[PDB]
Amino acid sequence: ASSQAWQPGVAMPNLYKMQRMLLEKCDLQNYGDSATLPKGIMMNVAKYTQLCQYLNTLTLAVPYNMRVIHFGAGSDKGVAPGTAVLRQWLPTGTLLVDSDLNDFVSDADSTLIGDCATVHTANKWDLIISDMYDPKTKNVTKENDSKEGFFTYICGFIQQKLALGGSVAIKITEHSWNADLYKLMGHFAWWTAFVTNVNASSSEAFLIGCNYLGKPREQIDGYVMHANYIFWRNTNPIQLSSYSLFDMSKFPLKLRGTAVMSLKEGQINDMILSLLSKGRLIIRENNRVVISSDVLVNN
Amino acid sequence: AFAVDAAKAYKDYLASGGQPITNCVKMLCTHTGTGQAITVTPEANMDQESFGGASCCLYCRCHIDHPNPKGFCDLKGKYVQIPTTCANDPVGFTLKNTVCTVCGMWKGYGCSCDQ
Ligand SMILES: [C]O[C]1[C]([O])[C]([C]OP([O])(=O)OP([O])(=O)OP([O])(=O)O[C][C]2O[C](N3=[C]N([C])C4=C3N=C([N])[N]C4=O)[C]([O])[C]2[O])O[C]1N1[C]=NC2=C1N=[C]N=C2[N]
Ligand SMILES: C[n+]1cn([C@@H]2O[C@H](COP(=O)(O)OP(=O)(O)OP(=O)(O)O)[C@@H](O)[C@H]2O)c2nc(N)[nH]c(=O)c21
Ligand SMILES: Nc1ncnc2c1ncn2[C@@H]1O[C@H](CSCC[C@H](N)C(=O)O)[C@@H](O)[C@H]1O
Ligand SMILES: [Cl-]
Ligand SMILES: [Zn+2]
Ligand SMILES: [Zn+2]
Secondary structure, three states, rough: OHHHHHOEEEEHHHHHHHHOOOOOOOOOOOOOOOOOOOOOHHHHHHHEEEEEEEEHOOEEEEEEEEEEEEEEEOOOOEEHHHHHHHHHHOOOOOOOEEEEOOEEEEOOOOEEEEOHHHHHEEEOOEEEEEEEOOOHHOOOOOOOOOOOOOHHHHHHHHHHHHHEEEEEEEEEEEOOOOOHHHHHOOOOOEEEEEEEEOOOOOOEEEEEEEEEEEOOOOOHHHHHHHHHHHHHHHHHHOOOEEEEEHOOOOOOOOOOOOOEEEEOOOOOOOOHHHHHHOOEEEEEOOOOOOOOOOOOOOO | OOOHHHHHHHHHHHOOOOOOOOOOOOOOOOOOOOOOOOOOOOOOOOOOEEEEHHHHHHHHOOOOOOOHHHHHHHHHOEEEEEEEHOOOHHHHHHHHOOEOOOOEEEEEEEOOOOO
Protein backbone atom coordinates (compact mmCIF):
# COMPACT_ATOMS: atom_id res chain seq x y z
CA ALA A 1 0.00 0.00 0.00
CA SER A 2 1.84 3.15 -1.31
CA SER A 3 1.20 6.64 0.19
CA GLN A 4 -0.97 7.14 -2.98
CA ALA A 5 -3.49 4.55 -1.68
CA TRP A 6 -4.65 7.35 0.71
CA GLN A 7 -5.14 9.88 -2.15
CA PRO A 8 -8.37 10.05 -4.25
CA GLY A 9 -6.28 8.96 -7.27
CA VAL A 10 -2.98 9.36 -9.16
CA ALA A 11 -2.01 12.15 -11.62
CA MET A 12 0.38 11.50 -14.56
CA PRO A 13 3.87 12.69 -13.46
CA ASN A 14 5.52 15.62 -15.38
CA LEU A 15 8.49 13.44 -16.46
CA TYR A 16 6.12 11.07 -18.35
CA LYS A 17 4.56 14.05 -20.20
CA MET A 18 8.04 15.10 -21.57
CA GLN A 19 8.76 11.70 -23.28
CA ARG A 20 8.17 10.82 -26.98
CA MET A 21 6.91 7.21 -26.83
CA LEU A 22 5.20 5.16 -29.61
CA LEU A 23 1.65 3.92 -29.03
CA GLU A 24 1.69 0.35 -27.59
CA LYS A 25 -1.14 -1.90 -26.33
CA CYS A 26 -2.29 -1.06 -22.78
CA ASP A 27 -1.58 -4.16 -20.59
CA LEU A 28 -2.50 -3.29 -16.95
CA GLN A 29 -1.14 -5.69 -14.27
CA ASN A 30 -4.48 -5.72 -12.33
CA TYR A 31 -6.83 -5.35 -15.38
CA GLY A 32 -10.35 -6.65 -14.52
CA ASP A 33 -9.89 -6.41 -10.70
CA SER A 34 -12.67 -4.62 -8.69
CA ALA A 35 -12.17 -2.29 -5.71
CA THR A 36 -13.89 -2.87 -2.32
CA LEU A 37 -16.55 -0.10 -1.99
CA PRO A 38 -18.37 1.18 1.12
CA LYS A 39 -21.58 -0.91 1.60
CA GLY A 40 -24.34 0.08 -0.90
CA ILE A 41 -22.20 2.66 -2.82
CA MET A 42 -22.40 2.55 -6.68
CA MET A 43 -19.13 2.49 -8.67
CA ASN A 44 -19.91 5.83 -10.40
CA VAL A 45 -20.64 7.50 -7.04
CA ALA A 46 -17.18 6.42 -5.77
CA LYS A 47 -15.53 7.47 -9.08
CA TYR A 48 -17.15 10.96 -9.16
CA THR A 49 -16.41 11.46 -5.42
CA GLN A 50 -12.64 10.76 -5.96
CA LEU A 51 -12.58 13.08 -9.02
CA CYS A 52 -14.18 15.94 -7.01
CA GLN A 53 -11.83 15.20 -4.05
CA TYR A 54 -8.92 15.71 -6.51
CA LEU A 55 -10.49 18.82 -8.19
CA ASN A 56 -10.63 20.41 -4.66
CA THR A 57 -6.78 20.57 -4.72
CA LEU A 58 -6.62 22.52 -8.03
CA THR A 59 -6.86 26.31 -8.65
CA LEU A 60 -10.46 26.03 -9.92
CA ALA A 61 -12.26 29.36 -10.46
CA VAL A 62 -15.46 29.14 -8.31
CA PRO A 63 -17.71 32.22 -8.71
CA TYR A 64 -21.24 33.02 -7.44
CA ASN A 65 -23.94 31.64 -9.82
CA MET A 66 -21.28 29.23 -11.22
CA ARG A 67 -22.18 27.39 -14.47
CA VAL A 68 -21.38 23.64 -14.76
CA ILE A 69 -22.41 21.44 -17.74
CA HIS A 70 -22.10 17.61 -17.48
CA PHE A 71 -22.10 15.47 -20.70
CA GLY A 72 -22.58 11.66 -20.50
CA ALA A 73 -24.64 11.93 -17.29
CA GLY A 74 -27.03 9.04 -18.04
CA SER A 75 -26.60 5.28 -17.35
CA ASP A 76 -28.36 1.98 -18.30
CA LYS A 77 -29.84 2.15 -14.71
CA GLY A 78 -31.86 5.24 -15.83
CA VAL A 79 -30.37 7.51 -13.09
CA ALA A 80 -27.48 10.07 -12.87
CA PRO A 81 -25.13 9.05 -9.98
CA GLY A 82 -22.35 11.44 -11.11
CA THR A 83 -24.87 14.33 -11.28
CA ALA A 84 -25.99 13.48 -7.70
CA VAL A 85 -22.30 13.87 -6.58
CA LEU A 86 -21.67 17.13 -8.56
CA ARG A 87 -24.86 18.51 -6.89
CA GLN A 88 -23.40 17.49 -3.46
CA TRP A 89 -19.97 18.93 -4.35
CA LEU A 90 -20.95 22.29 -5.93
CA PRO A 91 -21.87 25.37 -3.84
CA THR A 92 -25.61 26.08 -3.46
CA GLY A 93 -26.81 28.43 -6.26
CA THR A 94 -24.57 26.70 -8.86
CA LEU A 95 -26.42 26.17 -12.19
CA LEU A 96 -25.92 22.49 -13.19
CA VAL A 97 -27.03 21.25 -16.65
CA ASP A 98 -26.53 17.60 -17.66
CA SER A 99 -27.12 15.63 -20.92
CA ASP A 100 -26.97 12.10 -22.42
CA LEU A 101 -27.98 10.26 -25.64
CA ASN A 102 -30.52 8.14 -23.70
CA ASP A 103 -33.35 9.17 -21.31
CA PHE A 104 -32.50 9.32 -17.52
CA VAL A 105 -33.75 11.11 -14.35
CA SER A 106 -31.37 13.70 -12.83
CA ASP A 107 -30.97 16.07 -9.82
CA ALA A 108 -29.69 18.72 -12.28
CA ASP A 109 -31.47 22.06 -12.90
CA SER A 110 -31.94 21.15 -16.64
CA THR A 111 -31.48 17.82 -18.48
CA LEU A 112 -31.07 17.68 -22.32
CA ILE A 113 -31.67 14.26 -24.01
CA GLY A 114 -30.08 13.48 -27.41
CA ASP A 115 -26.68 13.35 -29.17
CA CYS A 116 -24.36 16.13 -27.82
CA ALA A 117 -24.09 17.43 -31.43
CA THR A 118 -27.77 18.63 -31.11
CA VAL A 119 -27.02 20.65 -27.89
CA HIS A 120 -26.61 24.45 -28.43
CA THR A 121 -26.13 27.25 -25.87
CA ALA A 122 -25.77 31.06 -26.04
CA ASN A 123 -23.73 31.19 -22.78
CA LYS A 124 -20.17 30.24 -21.76
CA TRP A 125 -19.55 27.73 -18.90
CA ASP A 126 -17.15 27.75 -15.89
CA LEU A 127 -16.66 23.95 -15.61
CA ILE A 128 -17.22 21.11 -18.16
CA ILE A 129 -17.33 17.39 -17.14
CA SER A 130 -17.69 14.65 -19.83
CA ASP A 131 -18.13 10.92 -18.98
CA MET A 132 -19.28 10.17 -22.55
CA TYR A 133 -17.99 6.86 -23.98
CA ASP A 134 -19.22 5.13 -27.18
CA PRO A 135 -19.85 1.41 -26.50
CA LYS A 136 -18.73 0.71 -30.15
CA THR A 137 -15.18 1.63 -28.99
CA LYS A 138 -15.15 -2.00 -27.68
CA ASN A 139 -14.80 -3.19 -31.35
CA VAL A 140 -10.99 -2.98 -31.70
CA THR A 141 -10.81 -4.27 -35.33
CA LYS A 142 -7.85 -2.05 -36.41
CA GLU A 143 -5.07 0.35 -35.22
CA ASN A 144 -5.85 2.46 -32.10
CA ASP A 145 -6.46 5.82 -33.90
CA SER A 146 -7.67 9.22 -32.63
CA LYS A 147 -11.49 8.72 -32.39
CA GLU A 148 -13.94 11.47 -33.50
CA GLY A 149 -17.68 11.39 -32.76
CA PHE A 150 -18.55 13.32 -29.57
CA PHE A 151 -14.79 14.21 -29.21
CA THR A 152 -15.16 16.58 -32.20
CA TYR A 153 -18.15 18.34 -30.58
CA ILE A 154 -16.21 18.59 -27.24
CA CYS A 155 -13.16 20.25 -28.86
CA GLY A 156 -15.52 22.78 -30.49
CA PHE A 157 -17.53 23.35 -27.31
CA ILE A 158 -14.30 23.99 -25.27
CA GLN A 159 -12.93 26.58 -27.76
CA GLN A 160 -16.35 28.33 -28.16
CA LYS A 161 -18.29 27.93 -24.85
CA LEU A 162 -15.66 27.62 -22.06
CA ALA A 163 -15.11 30.88 -20.12
CA LEU A 164 -11.44 31.90 -19.78
CA GLY A 165 -10.25 30.74 -16.31
CA GLY A 166 -12.69 27.82 -16.75
CA SER A 167 -11.67 24.16 -16.28
CA VAL A 168 -12.59 20.75 -17.82
CA ALA A 169 -12.42 17.05 -16.86
CA ILE A 170 -12.92 14.73 -19.91
CA LYS A 171 -13.05 10.91 -19.58
CA ILE A 172 -10.73 8.98 -21.95
CA THR A 173 -9.66 5.28 -22.21
CA GLU A 174 -6.93 3.37 -24.17
CA HIS A 175 -9.23 3.36 -27.28
CA SER A 176 -11.69 6.19 -26.37
CA TRP A 177 -9.42 9.24 -27.01
CA ASN A 178 -8.76 12.13 -29.43
CA ALA A 179 -5.52 13.91 -30.47
CA ASP A 180 -7.02 17.43 -30.88
CA LEU A 181 -8.25 17.11 -27.26
CA TYR A 182 -4.65 16.47 -26.02
CA LYS A 183 -3.48 19.48 -28.14
CA LEU A 184 -6.15 21.63 -26.33
CA MET A 185 -4.79 20.76 -22.85
CA GLY A 186 -1.90 23.05 -23.97
CA HIS A 187 -4.37 26.03 -23.97
CA PHE A 188 -4.76 25.78 -20.13
CA ALA A 189 -2.46 27.12 -17.35
CA TRP A 190 -1.95 23.46 -16.35
CA TRP A 191 -3.21 19.94 -17.28
CA THR A 192 -2.83 16.26 -16.25
CA ALA A 193 -4.38 12.81 -16.80
CA PHE A 194 -6.04 11.68 -13.53
CA VAL A 195 -6.81 8.03 -12.58
CA THR A 196 -9.26 7.36 -9.72
CA ASN A 197 -7.99 4.84 -7.11
CA VAL A 198 -11.32 2.87 -7.18
CA ASN A 199 -11.02 2.35 -10.98
CA ALA A 200 -7.17 2.11 -11.09
CA SER A 201 -7.58 -1.27 -12.92
CA SER A 202 -9.02 0.52 -16.03
CA SER A 203 -7.16 2.48 -18.80
CA GLU A 204 -9.75 5.18 -18.01
CA ALA A 205 -8.45 8.60 -16.94
CA PHE A 206 -9.88 12.13 -16.83
CA LEU A 207 -7.94 14.68 -18.91
CA ILE A 208 -8.11 17.78 -16.65
CA GLY A 209 -7.56 21.23 -18.21
CA CYS A 210 -7.10 23.80 -15.41
CA ASN A 211 -7.74 27.56 -16.10
CA TYR A 212 -8.45 28.09 -19.86
CA LEU A 213 -6.28 30.84 -21.46
CA GLY A 214 -7.98 30.81 -24.92
CA LYS A 215 -4.54 30.56 -26.61
CA PRO A 216 -1.87 27.79 -26.68
CA ARG A 217 0.74 28.09 -23.87
CA GLU A 218 2.29 24.69 -24.74
CA GLN A 219 2.72 22.87 -28.11
CA ILE A 220 1.30 19.30 -27.56
CA ASP A 221 1.20 16.41 -30.10
CA GLY A 222 -1.91 14.35 -29.21
CA TYR A 223 -0.54 11.18 -30.86
CA VAL A 224 2.68 11.42 -28.79
CA MET A 225 0.99 12.46 -25.51
CA HIS A 226 -1.50 9.52 -25.63
CA ALA A 227 1.45 7.10 -26.12
CA ASN A 228 3.16 8.82 -23.12
CA TYR A 229 -0.09 8.18 -21.12
CA ILE A 230 -0.30 4.45 -22.08
CA PHE A 231 3.45 4.08 -21.33
CA TRP A 232 2.90 5.59 -17.84
CA ARG A 233 -0.14 3.33 -17.21
CA ASN A 234 1.78 0.21 -18.43
CA THR A 235 4.85 0.92 -16.24
CA ASN A 236 3.09 2.24 -13.06
CA PRO A 237 0.62 -0.31 -11.66
CA ILE A 238 -1.77 1.59 -9.31
CA GLN A 239 -3.17 -0.27 -6.27
CA LEU A 240 -7.03 -0.21 -6.24
CA SER A 241 -8.12 1.81 -3.17
CA SER A 242 -11.33 3.33 -1.73
CA TYR A 243 -9.75 4.84 1.44
CA SER A 244 -10.38 8.50 0.40
CA LEU A 245 -14.17 7.72 0.40
CA PHE A 246 -14.18 7.23 4.24
CA ASP A 247 -13.35 10.91 5.05
CA MET A 248 -16.10 13.18 3.59
CA SER A 249 -15.49 16.07 6.06
CA LYS A 250 -13.63 18.35 3.53
CA PHE A 251 -15.58 17.31 0.35
CA PRO A 252 -17.73 20.40 -0.53
CA LEU A 253 -16.06 22.82 -2.99
CA LYS A 254 -15.23 26.19 -1.29
CA LEU A 255 -17.08 29.18 -2.88
CA ARG A 256 -13.84 31.20 -3.57
CA GLY A 257 -16.22 33.93 -4.89
CA THR A 258 -13.98 34.32 -7.99
CA ALA A 259 -14.51 37.60 -9.94
CA VAL A 260 -16.53 37.44 -13.23
CA MET A 261 -15.66 40.16 -15.82
CA SER A 262 -16.80 40.83 -19.42
CA LEU A 263 -13.53 41.95 -21.17
CA LYS A 264 -12.96 41.80 -25.00
CA GLU A 265 -9.94 40.27 -26.85
CA GLY A 266 -8.28 43.70 -26.27
CA GLN A 267 -7.91 43.92 -22.44
CA ILE A 268 -6.15 40.45 -22.41
CA ASN A 269 -2.61 41.32 -21.15
CA ASP A 270 -0.07 39.52 -18.86
CA MET A 271 -1.54 40.96 -15.59
CA ILE A 272 -4.85 39.25 -16.61
CA LEU A 273 -3.44 35.85 -17.81
CA SER A 274 -1.70 35.75 -14.38
CA LEU A 275 -5.09 36.02 -12.56
CA LEU A 276 -6.71 33.43 -14.92
CA SER A 277 -3.77 30.98 -14.26
CA LYS A 278 -4.57 31.05 -10.49
CA GLY A 279 -8.38 30.69 -10.81
CA ARG A 280 -8.67 34.28 -9.46
CA LEU A 281 -10.71 35.40 -12.54
CA ILE A 282 -13.48 34.13 -14.92
CA ILE A 283 -13.98 36.05 -18.21
CA ARG A 284 -17.46 35.76 -19.79
CA GLU A 285 -20.88 37.43 -20.24
CA ASN A 286 -23.12 37.21 -17.12
CA ASN A 287 -26.41 37.01 -19.16
CA ARG A 288 -29.27 34.58 -18.28
CA VAL A 289 -28.58 30.92 -19.32
CA VAL A 290 -30.34 29.60 -22.50
CA ILE A 291 -29.81 26.04 -23.90
CA SER A 292 -31.58 24.26 -26.81
CA SER A 293 -31.68 20.70 -28.27
CA ASP A 294 -32.05 20.39 -32.10
CA VAL A 295 -34.91 18.12 -33.29
CA LEU A 296 -34.56 16.42 -36.70
CA VAL A 297 -38.10 16.12 -38.22
CA ASN A 298 -38.71 12.98 -40.41
CA ASN A 299 -41.89 11.04 -41.43
CA ALA B 1 -61.23 11.92 -15.17
CA PHE B 2 -59.26 8.61 -15.05
CA ALA B 3 -56.50 9.81 -12.64
CA VAL B 4 -53.69 7.14 -12.70
CA ASP B 5 -52.96 6.54 -8.94
CA ALA B 6 -49.48 4.90 -9.22
CA ALA B 7 -48.68 5.94 -5.59
CA LYS B 8 -51.24 3.27 -4.50
CA ALA B 9 -50.58 0.83 -7.41
CA TYR B 10 -47.03 0.56 -5.90
CA LYS B 11 -48.31 -0.01 -2.30
CA ASP B 12 -50.53 -2.80 -3.82
CA TYR B 13 -47.50 -4.17 -5.81
CA LEU B 14 -45.23 -4.33 -2.68
CA ALA B 15 -47.93 -5.94 -0.44
CA SER B 16 -48.27 -8.60 -3.22
CA GLY B 17 -44.60 -9.55 -2.50
CA GLY B 18 -43.12 -7.33 -5.27
CA GLN B 19 -39.37 -6.37 -5.60
CA PRO B 20 -38.89 -2.66 -4.62
CA ILE B 21 -37.61 -0.06 -7.16
CA THR B 22 -33.78 -0.38 -7.19
CA ASN B 23 -30.84 1.79 -8.34
CA CYS B 24 -31.65 4.58 -5.86
CA VAL B 25 -28.43 6.69 -5.63
CA LYS B 26 -26.96 6.45 -2.08
CA MET B 27 -24.49 9.25 -1.21
CA LEU B 28 -21.19 9.23 0.77
CA CYS B 29 -21.45 11.56 3.80
CA THR B 30 -20.06 11.96 7.37
CA HIS B 31 -23.40 10.80 8.88
CA THR B 32 -23.31 13.78 11.33
CA GLY B 33 -26.10 15.91 9.79
CA THR B 34 -29.40 17.41 11.09
CA GLY B 35 -31.36 14.21 10.23
CA GLN B 36 -34.02 16.28 8.39
CA ALA B 37 -36.03 14.44 5.67
CA ILE B 38 -35.37 16.69 2.57
CA THR B 39 -32.22 18.90 2.42
CA VAL B 40 -30.19 20.86 -0.22
CA THR B 41 -27.23 18.64 0.85
CA PRO B 42 -26.85 15.14 2.43
CA GLU B 43 -27.83 15.48 6.14
CA ALA B 44 -27.92 11.78 7.13
CA ASN B 45 -27.17 11.05 10.82
CA MET B 46 -25.65 7.84 12.33
CA ASP B 47 -29.17 6.24 11.89
CA GLN B 48 -29.79 7.41 8.26
CA GLU B 49 -28.44 7.00 4.67
CA SER B 50 -28.70 9.99 2.22
CA PHE B 51 -29.98 9.51 -1.38
CA GLY B 52 -30.41 11.72 -4.47
CA GLY B 53 -34.06 12.88 -4.64
CA ALA B 54 -34.74 12.25 -8.36
CA SER B 55 -33.72 8.54 -7.91
CA CYS B 56 -36.21 8.14 -4.97
CA CYS B 57 -39.22 9.91 -6.63
CA LEU B 58 -41.82 7.42 -8.02
CA TYR B 59 -43.14 10.01 -10.53
CA CYS B 60 -39.59 10.86 -11.73
CA ARG B 61 -38.60 7.12 -11.91
CA CYS B 62 -41.79 6.16 -13.88
CA HIS B 63 -41.72 9.17 -16.28
CA ILE B 64 -45.27 10.28 -15.26
CA ASP B 65 -46.91 13.55 -14.08
CA HIS B 66 -46.23 14.91 -10.53
CA PRO B 67 -49.51 15.52 -8.62
CA ASN B 68 -48.63 19.18 -7.82
CA PRO B 69 -49.59 22.70 -9.10
CA LYS B 70 -47.34 23.28 -12.22
CA GLY B 71 -45.95 19.68 -11.83
CA PHE B 72 -43.17 20.85 -9.42
CA CYS B 73 -41.05 17.99 -7.90
CA ASP B 74 -39.80 18.51 -4.28
CA LEU B 75 -37.27 15.58 -4.39
CA LYS B 76 -35.50 16.32 -7.75
CA GLY B 77 -32.42 18.46 -6.88
CA LYS B 78 -32.46 17.56 -3.15
CA TYR B 79 -31.34 14.68 -0.89
CA VAL B 80 -33.75 12.48 1.08
CA GLN B 81 -32.58 10.93 4.43
CA ILE B 82 -33.95 7.35 4.97
CA PRO B 83 -33.72 5.43 8.29
CA THR B 84 -30.92 2.83 7.79
CA THR B 85 -33.57 0.13 8.61
CA CYS B 86 -35.94 1.14 5.73
CA ALA B 87 -33.16 1.89 3.15
CA ASN B 88 -34.04 -1.34 1.20
CA ASP B 89 -37.02 0.59 -0.36
CA PRO B 90 -36.48 4.40 -0.32
CA VAL B 91 -39.24 5.10 -2.93
CA GLY B 92 -41.81 3.22 -0.78
CA PHE B 93 -40.64 5.10 2.35
CA THR B 94 -41.12 8.62 0.78
CA LEU B 95 -44.82 7.79 -0.02
CA LYS B 96 -45.94 5.98 3.20
CA ASN B 97 -44.35 8.65 5.50
CA THR B 98 -44.91 12.43 6.01
CA VAL B 99 -42.53 15.38 6.78
CA CYS B 100 -43.16 17.64 9.85
CA THR B 101 -43.62 21.29 8.69
CA VAL B 102 -42.48 22.53 12.14
CA CYS B 103 -39.04 20.79 12.65
CA GLY B 104 -38.52 19.27 9.14
CA MET B 105 -37.91 15.72 10.50
CA TRP B 106 -39.91 12.63 9.41
CA LYS B 107 -43.06 12.27 11.58
CA GLY B 108 -42.51 8.83 13.20
CA TYR B 109 -38.69 8.98 12.72
CA GLY B 110 -37.08 11.96 14.55
CA CYS B 111 -39.98 14.52 14.80
CA SER B 112 -40.31 15.09 18.59
CA CYS B 113 -42.76 18.08 18.56
CA ASP B 114 -45.17 16.01 20.79
CA GLN B 115 -42.94 14.59 23.62
C1 LIG C 1 -18.97 4.34 -16.95
O1 LIG C 1 -17.69 4.38 -17.63
C2 LIG C 1 -17.35 3.15 -18.28
C3 LIG C 1 -16.14 2.48 -17.69
O2 LIG C 1 -15.98 2.68 -16.29
C4 LIG C 1 -15.02 3.12 -18.49
C5 LIG C 1 -13.80 2.24 -18.52
O3 LIG C 1 -14.21 0.95 -18.92
P1 LIG C 1 -13.13 -0.16 -19.31
O4 LIG C 1 -13.91 -1.37 -19.74
O5 LIG C 1 -12.25 -0.48 -18.12
O6 LIG C 1 -12.20 0.44 -20.48
P2 LIG C 1 -10.78 -0.17 -20.89
O7 LIG C 1 -10.97 -1.61 -21.25
O8 LIG C 1 -9.74 -0.01 -19.81
O9 LIG C 1 -10.34 0.69 -22.18
P3 LIG C 1 -11.02 0.52 -23.63
O10 LIG C 1 -10.69 1.74 -24.45
O11 LIG C 1 -12.50 0.27 -23.56
O12 LIG C 1 -10.34 -0.79 -24.29
C6 LIG C 1 -11.07 -1.57 -25.23
C7 LIG C 1 -10.64 -3.03 -25.16
O13 LIG C 1 -9.21 -3.18 -25.13
C8 LIG C 1 -8.88 -4.28 -24.27
N1 LIG C 1 -8.02 -3.86 -23.14
C9 LIG C 1 -7.97 -2.42 -22.90
N2 LIG C 1 -7.04 -2.52 -21.79
C10 LIG C 1 -6.69 -1.22 -21.18
C11 LIG C 1 -6.64 -3.76 -21.48
C12 LIG C 1 -7.28 -4.63 -22.35
N3 LIG C 1 -7.06 -5.95 -22.27
C13 LIG C 1 -6.21 -6.38 -21.30
N4 LIG C 1 -5.99 -7.70 -21.21
N5 LIG C 1 -5.58 -5.54 -20.43
C14 LIG C 1 -5.78 -4.21 -20.50
O14 LIG C 1 -5.20 -3.45 -19.70
C15 LIG C 1 -10.18 -4.87 -23.76
O15 LIG C 1 -10.56 -5.99 -24.56
C16 LIG C 1 -11.16 -3.72 -23.91
O16 LIG C 1 -12.51 -4.16 -24.04
O17 LIG C 1 -15.54 3.33 -19.81
C17 LIG C 1 -16.96 3.36 -19.73
N6 LIG C 1 -17.53 2.23 -20.48
C18 LIG C 1 -16.95 1.04 -20.67
N7 LIG C 1 -17.80 0.26 -21.37
C19 LIG C 1 -18.92 0.98 -21.62
C20 LIG C 1 -18.75 2.22 -21.04
N8 LIG C 1 -19.75 3.14 -21.14
C21 LIG C 1 -20.89 2.87 -21.79
N9 LIG C 1 -21.08 1.67 -22.37
C22 LIG C 1 -20.11 0.71 -22.29
N10 LIG C 1 -20.31 -0.50 -22.87
C1 LIG D 1 -1.89 21.27 -9.06
N1 LIG D 1 -1.32 22.20 -10.04
C2 LIG D 1 -0.16 22.04 -10.67
N2 LIG D 1 0.22 23.21 -11.18
C3 LIG D 1 1.59 23.63 -11.54
O1 LIG D 1 2.50 22.53 -11.58
C4 LIG D 1 3.51 22.71 -10.55
C5 LIG D 1 3.91 21.36 -10.00
O2 LIG D 1 2.78 20.45 -10.06
P1 LIG D 1 2.44 19.45 -8.84
O3 LIG D 1 0.96 19.23 -8.79
O4 LIG D 1 3.31 18.25 -8.92
O5 LIG D 1 2.88 20.33 -7.57
P2 LIG D 1 3.89 20.04 -6.36
O6 LIG D 1 3.71 18.62 -5.92
O7 LIG D 1 5.24 20.51 -6.76
O8 LIG D 1 3.30 21.03 -5.24
P3 LIG D 1 3.11 20.98 -3.63
O9 LIG D 1 1.98 20.01 -3.37
O10 LIG D 1 2.78 22.39 -3.19
O11 LIG D 1 4.43 20.50 -3.06
C6 LIG D 1 2.83 23.68 -9.57
O12 LIG D 1 3.72 24.31 -8.66
C7 LIG D 1 2.18 24.63 -10.56
O13 LIG D 1 3.09 25.42 -11.29
C8 LIG D 1 -0.91 24.02 -11.25
N3 LIG D 1 -1.04 25.20 -11.89
C9 LIG D 1 -2.24 25.73 -11.77
N4 LIG D 1 -2.52 26.90 -12.36
N5 LIG D 1 -3.25 25.14 -11.06
C10 LIG D 1 -3.16 23.94 -10.38
O14 LIG D 1 -4.12 23.49 -9.76
C11 LIG D 1 -1.88 23.38 -10.51
N1 LIG E 1 -22.59 11.28 -28.75
C1 LIG E 1 -23.06 11.18 -27.51
N2 LIG E 1 -23.85 12.17 -27.03
C2 LIG E 1 -24.31 12.07 -25.78
N3 LIG E 1 -24.12 11.11 -24.88
C3 LIG E 1 -23.34 10.14 -25.38
C4 LIG E 1 -22.79 10.10 -26.65
N4 LIG E 1 -22.03 8.95 -26.81
C5 LIG E 1 -22.15 8.32 -25.67
N5 LIG E 1 -22.93 8.99 -24.75
C6 LIG E 1 -23.27 8.56 -23.40
O1 LIG E 1 -22.11 8.45 -22.62
C7 LIG E 1 -22.47 7.70 -21.44
C8 LIG E 1 -21.26 6.95 -20.92
S1 LIG E 1 -21.51 6.13 -19.32
C9 LIG E 1 -22.05 7.50 -18.27
C10 LIG E 1 -22.25 7.18 -16.79
C11 LIG E 1 -22.65 8.41 -15.97
N6 LIG E 1 -21.58 9.45 -16.00
C12 LIG E 1 -22.93 8.02 -14.51
O2 LIG E 1 -22.80 8.86 -13.59
O3 LIG E 1 -23.29 6.88 -14.21
C13 LIG E 1 -23.65 6.81 -21.86
O4 LIG E 1 -24.80 7.06 -21.05
C14 LIG E 1 -23.90 7.17 -23.33
O5 LIG E 1 -25.26 7.19 -23.67
CL1 LIG F 1 -0.36 11.68 -7.76
ZN1 LIG G 1 -40.07 13.78 -8.96
ZN1 LIG H 1 -41.70 18.08 14.32
